[PDB]
Structure 1
Amino acid sequence: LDTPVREKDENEFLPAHLELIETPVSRRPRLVAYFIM
């Protein structure tokens, strides 16, 4: 939480990678139903 922003978070927000990934899935897609039940 105190760590700064680095390459591992720099890469995933680069707009080209956004353009490739059509219908993108989030980092925590299964945590919703996991945290419900």
Structure 2
Amino acid sequence: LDTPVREKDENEFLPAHLELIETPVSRRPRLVAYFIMGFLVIAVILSVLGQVEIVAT
């Protein structure tokens, strides 16, 4: 995290490289969906395992 701007970072942002890459994608294209599906499965697991008491007045 403390490293300065390396040559990889500058090469990734060069206009020549960006112009050739048509229809680009994010750096990690499968992180948003992974986290959303993880949240969904954790929510389902908690809903099925979770227990709620019944109180009668």
When normalised by structure 2's length, the TM-score is 0.60
Structure number, greater radius of gyration:
2
Unaligned runs of 5+ in 1: none
Supply the RMSD in Å over aligned alpha carbons: 0.7
Instruction: List structure 1 runs of 4+ shifted beyond 2 angstroms.
Output: none
* Length, aligned pairs only: 37
Larger fraction in helix:
2
Unaligned runs of 5+ in 2: 38-57
Q: Percent identity?
A: 100
When normalised by structure 1's length, the TM-score is 0.86
